[PDB]
Amino acid sequence: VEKVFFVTSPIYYVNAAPHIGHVYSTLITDVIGRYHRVKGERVFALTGTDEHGQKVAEAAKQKQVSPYDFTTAVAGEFKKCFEQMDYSIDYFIRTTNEQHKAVVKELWTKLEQKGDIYLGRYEGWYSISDESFLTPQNITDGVDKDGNPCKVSLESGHVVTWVSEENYMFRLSAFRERLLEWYHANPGCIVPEFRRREVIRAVEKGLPDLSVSRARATLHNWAIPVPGNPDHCVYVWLDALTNYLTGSRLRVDESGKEVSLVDDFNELERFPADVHVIGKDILKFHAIYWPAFLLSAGLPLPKKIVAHGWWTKSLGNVFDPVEKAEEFGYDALKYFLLRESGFSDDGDYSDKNMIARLNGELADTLGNLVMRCTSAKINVNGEWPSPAAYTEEDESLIQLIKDLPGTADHYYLIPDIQKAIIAVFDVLRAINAYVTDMAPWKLVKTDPERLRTVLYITLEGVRVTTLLLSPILPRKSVVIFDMLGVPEVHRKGIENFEFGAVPPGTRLGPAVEGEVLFSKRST
């Protein structure tokens, strides 16, 4: 069925300033959203801040400022960061928002009515920094700020404390069979695949019930009250995960402010998420807890959870994304982050490798090709020529260009943005090779008829590759299209994935004295 394509980032803890992890997660979310908008679909892309809980309230206390003031200020820092990064997110949600709290209370009440919440106790380990319950098998020995013997989390390395409280408990154990059914019936619902296998193994072993409330004193009263019991607060993660539901129900105006909360999610056609973008650090919450809550409430499950390789959320290793983007370019940094790494940590993020990709891929492969086909020396009439008859070599390149949208489409839908980029650049390399073989600079004098054909194919290859790279290079793609003289109507829509969508006779855009797309930088 036709619906609004709904893509989300995690909502980030506001204990600290925005950093590369947050920017990376929201970048992926943004790229996916952009691709679906270029495809001509309706899109709602969501990001925001996770503002309640012990961790935030303790950070507020450290800075000697109220939780209200602290969260509002740090949220403002996140908004500013994402504006500076030139994202195109449709809404920024904050869990302190009154409409979100109403949704949390609805969902809580639904779970309780279904018989899935009971009053019990949690006695066990807890990482405040991850807001995560841990079993004894997931802890080990380590050290704290004092350098004194303490327990730490195996998953994250943060300090764990023993908790013994009477707590509202969600009957997670009862959802094991249904979760396993879901994973097996939808074998692309978690990506990448090895992370799907991890989740399945964990659920097969068995699920304990889950504490979904805490004593109010423990959280410094900085959380959502349990409906019908003011002494208890809603677990920060049930609160947090519900943001996706709240977002799916907010009507938003032209300026991006929330103006209304609808009763029925179906009214806005967003829920459930088509893609939840997350870091590997929060996989269990999204692939186990979240769907169990939705199953309890009788709500539809998300289509895909994609978990990337970075562990999101003084030592002398600073990476400021705004600083690096001011140095190397915003689109270039975005390209680098999405190209350098797939679902690993193992990528190299040095200035050396950044420069190597800028120079070799963006400047030498893409930019060079754009200048060649728009150059006055080669394109003497400053237009899209009408092609003459095609050779076999012409047809081999044309075939690559025609196959590219379908290939790139599949990669974007996985989603696997690294492979989408690689596929496009494989075609760009082939076009370059073709240009080198045809030597159009010699044809200008020798064989003008032949040049028409070569020039046309080259222009069309640059257009199609650029269209498919426009989610990755949103600003530079616009520059490229302006140079090519591609009318606005042809810059989006699946109709324009087709070879030959821009007619011969189309005039190129004006030139500038010494304009460069991507300036190469010192080795």
Task: List interacting residues with ligand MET (CB under 6 A).
Answer: 10-13, 50, 240-241, 243, 282, 312-313
How many Å is the Cα radius of gyration of the chain? 26
Q: In the bound complex, what is the minimum distance in angstroms from residue 9's beta carbon to ligand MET?
A: 8
11 or 421: whose CB is closer to ligand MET? 11
Give the amino acid at 312: T
245 or 397: whose CB is closer to ligand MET? 245
Q: In the bound complex, what is the minimum distance in angstroms from residue 244's beta carbon to ligand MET?
A: 7
Quick check: 280 and 345 in contact, CB under 8 A?
no
Query: Hunting for tokens 């380590």 — which residue is that?
Result: 142
Cis? peptide before 415, omega within 30° of 0: yes
Q: In the bound complex, what is the minimum distance in angstroms from residue 106's beta carbon to ligand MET?
A: 17
54 or 458: whose CB is closer to ligand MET? 54
CA distance 79 to 18: 9
Q: In the bound complex, what is the minimum distance in angstroms from residue 279's beta carbon to ligand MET?
A: 7
Give the amino acid at 289: Y
Quick check: 484 and 462 in contact, CB under 8 A?
yes
Q: Are strands 139-143 and 160-170 parallel, antiparallel or unpaired?
A: unpaired
305 or 455: whose CB is closer to ligand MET? 305
Q: In the bound complex, what is the minimum distance in angstroms from residue 420's beta carbon to ligand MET?
A: 25
Residue 448: phi and psi, rounded to 5, are -60, -35
Q: In the bound complex, what is the minimum distance in angstroms from residue 95's beta carbon to ligand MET?
A: 9
Residue 202: phi and psi, rounded to 5, are -60, -45
Give the amino acid at 399: Q
156 or 365: whose CB is closer to ligand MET? 156
243 or 248: whose CB is closer to ligand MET? 243
DSSP state of 40: T
Element (H, E) at 283: helix 283-284
133 or 481: whose CB is closer to ligand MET? 133
Residue 505: phi and psi, rounded to 5, are 100, -25
Q: In the bound complex, what is the minimum distance in angstroms from residue 91's beta carbon to ligand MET?
A: 15
Instruction: List 278's β-bridge partners, or say none.
Output: 307
